Design a protein around this motif. Structure first.
Motif, PDB file in Angstrom:
ATOM      1  N   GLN A  13     -23.546-125.635  -4.383  1.00  0.00           N
ATOM      2  CA  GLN A  13     -22.102-125.896  -4.142  1.00  0.00           C
ATOM      3  C   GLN A  13     -21.820-125.744  -2.622  1.00  0.00           C
ATOM      4  OE1 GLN A  13     -22.882-124.250  -7.577  1.00  0.00           O
ATOM      5  NE2 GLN A  13     -22.613-126.430  -7.909  1.00  0.00           N
ATOM      6  N   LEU A  14     -21.060-126.711  -2.087  1.00  0.00           N
ATOM      7  CA  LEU A  14     -20.748-126.803  -0.644  1.00  0.00           C
ATOM      8  C   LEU A  14     -19.279-126.353  -0.408  1.00  0.00           C
ATOM      9  CD1 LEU A  14     -21.364-127.624   2.325  1.00  0.00           C
ATOM     10  CD2 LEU A  14     -21.143-130.047   1.633  1.00  0.00           C
ATOM     11  N   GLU A  15     -19.116-125.180   0.233  1.00  0.00           N
ATOM     12  CA  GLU A  15     -17.789-124.639   0.628  1.00  0.00           C
ATOM     13  C   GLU A  15     -17.608-124.800   2.166  1.00  0.00           C
ATOM     14  OE1 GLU A  15     -16.156-120.700  -1.263  1.00  0.00           O
ATOM     15  OE2 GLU A  15     -16.368-120.224   0.865  1.00  0.00           O
ATOM     16  N   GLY A  16     -16.476-125.403   2.552  1.00  0.00           N
ATOM     17  CA  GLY A  16     -16.056-125.512   3.977  1.00  0.00           C
ATOM     18  C   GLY A  16     -16.789-126.454   4.964  1.00  0.00           C
ATOM     19  N   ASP A  17     -17.718-127.290   4.473  1.00  0.00           N
ATOM     20  CA  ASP A  17     -18.770-127.960   5.298  1.00  0.00           C
ATOM     21  C   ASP A  17     -19.660-126.988   6.155  1.00  0.00           C
ATOM     22  OD1 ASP A  17     -19.749-130.991   5.576  1.00  0.00           O
ATOM     23  OD2 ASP A  17     -19.663-130.281   7.644  1.00  0.00           O
ATOM     24  N   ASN A  18     -20.134-125.880   5.543  1.00  0.00           N
ATOM     25  CA  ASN A  18     -20.966-124.851   6.226  1.00  0.00           C
ATOM     26  C   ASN A  18     -21.831-124.002   5.249  1.00  0.00           C
ATOM     27  OD1 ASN A  18     -18.255-123.323   5.920  1.00  0.00           O
ATOM     28  ND2 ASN A  18     -19.178-121.733   7.166  1.00  0.00           N
ATOM     29  N   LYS A  19     -21.290-123.520   4.109  1.00  0.00           N
ATOM     30  CA  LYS A  19     -22.048-122.681   3.144  1.00  0.00           C
ATOM     31  C   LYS A  19     -22.695-123.554   2.039  1.00  0.00           C
ATOM     32  CE  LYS A  19     -19.379-118.207   3.479  1.00  0.00           C
ATOM     33  NZ  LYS A  19     -20.482-117.258   3.732  1.00  0.00           N
ATOM     34  N   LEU A  20     -24.019-123.408   1.871  1.00  0.00           N
ATOM     35  CA  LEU A  20     -24.775-123.991   0.734  1.00  0.00           C
ATOM     36  C   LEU A  20     -25.238-122.799  -0.151  1.00  0.00           C
ATOM     37  CD1 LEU A  20     -27.001-126.681   2.641  1.00  0.00           C
ATOM     38  CD2 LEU A  20     -25.030-127.243   1.159  1.00  0.00           C
ATOM     39  N   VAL A  21     -24.533-122.572  -1.277  1.00  0.00           N
ATOM     40  CA  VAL A  21     -24.743-121.382  -2.156  1.00  0.00           C
ATOM     41  C   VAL A  21     -25.413-121.830  -3.488  1.00  0.00           C
ATOM     42  CG1 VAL A  21     -22.946-119.854  -1.091  1.00  0.00           C
ATOM     43  CG2 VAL A  21     -22.249-121.296  -3.041  1.00  0.00           C
ATOM     44  N   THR A  22     -26.546-121.196  -3.856  1.00  0.00           N
ATOM     45  CA  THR A  22     -27.255-121.500  -5.140  1.00  0.00           C
ATOM     46  C   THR A  22     -27.991-120.252  -5.720  1.00  0.00           C
ATOM     47  OG1 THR A  22     -28.375-123.326  -6.294  1.00  0.00           O
ATOM     48  CG2 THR A  22     -29.511-122.619  -4.291  1.00  0.00           C
ATOM     49  N   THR A  23     -28.224-120.261  -7.049  1.00  0.00           N
ATOM     50  CA  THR A  23     -28.991-119.196  -7.759  1.00  0.00           C
ATOM     51  C   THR A  23     -30.312-119.850  -8.258  1.00  0.00           C
ATOM     52  OG1 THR A  23     -26.939-118.006  -8.340  1.00  0.00           O
ATOM     53  CG2 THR A  23     -28.850-117.398  -9.629  1.00  0.00           C
ATOM     54  N   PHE A  24     -31.419-119.522  -7.571  1.00  0.00           N
ATOM     55  CA  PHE A  24     -32.701-120.276  -7.644  1.00  0.00           C
ATOM     56  C   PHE A  24     -33.589-119.655  -8.765  1.00  0.00           C
ATOM     57  CE2 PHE A  24     -35.035-123.409  -4.799  1.00  0.00           C
ATOM     58  CZ  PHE A  24     -36.363-122.998  -4.852  1.00  0.00           C
ATOM     59  N   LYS A  25     -34.590-118.826  -8.419  1.00  0.00           N
ATOM     60  CA  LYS A  25     -35.370-118.012  -9.399  1.00  0.00           C
ATOM     61  C   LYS A  25     -34.990-116.519  -9.184  1.00  0.00           C
ATOM     62  CE  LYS A  25     -38.319-119.032 -12.046  1.00  0.00           C
ATOM     63  NZ  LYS A  25     -38.305-119.450 -13.460  1.00  0.00           N
ATOM     64  N   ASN A  26     -33.811-116.110  -9.704  1.00  0.00           N
ATOM     65  CA  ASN A  26     -33.136-114.824  -9.362  1.00  0.00           C
ATOM     66  C   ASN A  26     -32.968-114.517  -7.826  1.00  0.00           C
ATOM     67  OD1 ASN A  26     -34.735-114.228 -12.316  1.00  0.00           O
ATOM     68  ND2 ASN A  26     -32.669-113.421 -12.403  1.00  0.00           N
ATOM     69  N   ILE A  27     -32.590-115.547  -7.040  1.00  0.00           N
ATOM     70  CA  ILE A  27     -32.524-115.488  -5.555  1.00  0.00           C
ATOM     71  C   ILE A  27     -31.150-116.133  -5.229  1.00  0.00           C
ATOM     72  CG2 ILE A  27     -33.539-116.411  -3.340  1.00  0.00           C
ATOM     73  CD1 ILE A  27     -36.279-116.670  -5.135  1.00  0.00           C
TER      74      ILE A  27
END
Length: 126
Positions: free
Chosen positions: A83-97
């Motif tokens: 998910q892209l917030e503000g054109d700066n943060k790329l936030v994801t839940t990978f393999k418990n990361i």
């Protein structure tokens, strides 16, 4: 703006993160000295990223909102959408990361938090 070729400057927890997932001490002590160029190309929702990691180049692509199969380091495939917030943060839940990748001016942080581990890369836009 994410279209750029971001080379590694200061790497915080490479020994603590790579042994916690499943990697050898020879590739940890080799890739800490090698400054890796982490490419990112934004079209809009599609993101084509090419990480030059030590010797082998690992390239994958995510679509923002719609499910994507990215290569995990120990396994092979992981369903994990960014998910892209503000054109700066790329936030994801990978393999418990929790991979929180913020863009501050002309750099990029990649703060991959595996429980107690805090793996912080600081790679400058080059």
């Amino acid at each position: 703006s994410f279209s750029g070729k971001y080379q590694l400057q200061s790497q915080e927890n490479f020994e603590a993160f790579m042994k916690a997932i499943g990697l050898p001490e020879e590739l940890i002590q080799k890739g800490k000295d090698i400054k890796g160029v982490s490419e990112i190309v934004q079209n809009g929702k599609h993101f084509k990223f090419t990480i030059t990691a030590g010797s082998k180049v690992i390239q994958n692509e995510f679509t923002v909102g719609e499910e994507c199969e990215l290569e995990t380091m120990t396994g092979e495939k992981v369903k994990t959408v960014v998910q892209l917030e503000g054109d700066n943060k790329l936030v994801t839940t990978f393999k418990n990361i929790k991979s929180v990748t913020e863009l501050n001016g002309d750099i990029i942080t990649n703060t991959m938090t595996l429980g107690d581990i805090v793996f912080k890369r600081i790679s400058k836009r080059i």
